[PDB]
């Protein structure tokens, strides 16, 4: 178990300003558990989510580890409709 | 139809008398149309 | 020459463009700053993009945006009614980019410029214009709760 930060961009047509949560994840984890675990948290289901670290495009069958995310780093979250 | 935040932001360009018209046009319209924030 | 990014659409094409041109995009420019490769930008493909860096360039002398507020729509400038002079679904699709990018100039011009498309019309001459149709005994009763109100 570790803990990672999501953080999302200001989104006009919701009222929503740039925040941070936090997750706890597994290396393991696949890119569709963390965005069930996204919704599990703050209800957008994964249809609606994109996430990115460095600059990488998140793919939904991978893991974590694909992408050396570690202990505190922090992906970046559009969300789309 | 569509999506209903988009539709929002394009009905707080409508005067009282625009908005007036637009909860006729569909069910789903006259159903977003009752947000007291879009009367300010 | 000129510092430069680049940004790859969703359908998956790589755009180079000025910094200036690019940092309109308060999403584009903010996951600039945390600390060569090219920008994902979701749900953006190369049309609209193509379309969203034409107006960018266009207002790249553009202050950072103040927040609103009173809204009207008399005010497009002469520019962006010409460049919006397009099918109306990309219309919708430049609503949806300018949200996912953080513009607000063109969040605002295309929102305005729907609103334009229904000021002044009615429920059957709207309907036709966005293909919604009409869901006789309940307008009747809406037409008369919001007669003396507008």
Redesign the interface.
């Known amino acids: 178990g570790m803990q990672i930060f999501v953080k999302t961009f200001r989104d006009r047509l919701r009222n929503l300003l740039p925040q941070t949560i936090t997750l706890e994840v597994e290396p393991s984890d696949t890119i569709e558990n963390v965005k069930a675990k996204i919704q599990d948290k703050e209800g957008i289901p994964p249809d609606q989510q994109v996430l990115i670290f460095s600059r990488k495009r998140l793919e939904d069958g991978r893991t974590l580890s694909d992408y050396n995310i570690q202990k505190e780093s922090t992906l970046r979250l559009v969300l789309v409709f | 139809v569509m999506h209903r935040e988009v539709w929002m932001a394009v009905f707080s360009y409508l005067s009282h008398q625009d908005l007036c018209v637009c909860m006729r046009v569909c069910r789903t319209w006259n159903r977003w149309c009752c947000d007291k924030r879009l009367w300010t | 020459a000129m510092p430069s990014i680049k940004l790859q659409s969703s359908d998956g094409e790589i755009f180079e463009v000025d910094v200036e041109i690019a940092k309109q995009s308060?999403?584009i420019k903010?996951?600039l700053e945390?600390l060569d490769?090219?920008?994902?930008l979701?749900?953006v493909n190369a049309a609209i993009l193509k379309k969203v860096i034409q107006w960018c360039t266009h207002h790249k002398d553009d202050p950072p945006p103040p927040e609103d507020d009173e809204?009207?729509?008399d005010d497009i400038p002469v520019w962006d009614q010409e460049f919006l002079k397009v099918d109306q679904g990309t219309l919708?699709e430049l609503?949806?980019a300018a949200?996912?990018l953080?513009i607000?100039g063109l969040?605002d011009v295309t929102?305005?410029t729907?609103?334009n498309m229904?000021?002044?019309?009615?429920?059957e001459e709207?309907?036709k214009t966005?293909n919604?149709?009409?869901?006789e005994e309940?307008?009747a009763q809406?037409?008369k709760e919001?007669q003396w109100?507008?």
């Open positions: 308060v999403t903010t996951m945390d490769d090219p920008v994902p979701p749900n809204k009207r729509t919708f609503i949806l949200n996912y953080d607000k969040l929102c305005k729907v609103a229904i000021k002044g019309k009615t429920p709207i309907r966005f919604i149709k009409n869901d309940e307008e809406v037409r919001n109100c507008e």
